[PDB]
């Protein structure tokens, strides 16, 4: 038995773009600020559910944030050593805050 | 306490492209053939782990296929009624085959 149908394969684009920001840790706040139209993103440490340095690419890390919808922010640090510093700092701020 | 870091937000492109194919059901084989460089994809019904009509868009459906890596083929039928026919047909072929 044999039927043929006209169909479309749906395929997403795989390229990953990278838009420069400044990530600042200011007491218990994290700010994602563009350098010199994008508006500044202000996170409180209490909002961060996850912060993890990539097991694949040393310069990559992500911060998952509750603000039913978790925002997932993936980032690239200037270097693997900076990546470790940002992730460590944020993991320490989160430990410290969560202690209470 | 206050540190600022130069970082990149990593963002994937969200657009979904759609590349025409012909999907043919030929006994227990499904072929994904381009119409008139792409090579024909030949699936046996035993390879299909899932085939489901979208709950969001009537013309959409997907076929998940084992060939540790499952291929996920998302498609758009010419119409919602054709979508239902393709999905029904494939679900029936899978029932029939799996009966053994």
UniProtKB/Swiss-Prot annotation, chains A, B:
Compartmental location: Cell membrane; Vacuole membrane
Signal peptide feature range: none
Record PTM text: Autophosphorylated by TORC2.
Domain SIN1-type PH: 1-95
The protein's assembly and partners: The target of rapamycin complex 2 (TORC2) is composed of at least AVO1, AVO2, BIT61, LST8, TOR2 and TSC11. TORC2 forms a homodimer. Contrary to TORC1, TORC2 does not bind to and is not sensitive to FKBP-rapamycin. AVO1 is required for TORC2 integrity by tethering AVO2 and TSC11 to the complex.
Function text: Component of TORC2, which regulates cell cycle-dependent polarization of the actin-cytoskeleton and cell wall integrity. TORC2 controls polarity of the actin cytoskeleton, which is required for orienting the secretory pathway toward discrete growth sites, via the RHO1/PKC1/MAPK cell integrity pathway.
Miscellaneous comment: Present with 704 molecules/cell in log phase SD medium.
Family named by the database record: Belongs to the SIN1 family.
Name of this protein: Target of rapamycin complex 2 subunit AVO1
């Amino acid at each position: 038995a044999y039927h043929k149908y006209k169909v479309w394969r749906r395929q997403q684009m795989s390229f990953i773009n990278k838009h420069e920001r400044t990530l600042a840790i200011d007491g218990d706040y994290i700010y994602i600020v563009p350098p010199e139209n994008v508006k500044t993103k202000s996170l409180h440490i209490s909002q961060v559910v996850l912060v993890k340095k990539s097991k694949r690419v040393p310069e990559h890390f992500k911060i998952f944030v509750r603000r039913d919808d978790i925002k997932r922010y993936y980032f690239e640090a200037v270097s693997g050593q900076e990546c470790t510093e940002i992730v460590t700092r944020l993991q320490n701020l989160l430990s410290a805050y969560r202690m209470n």
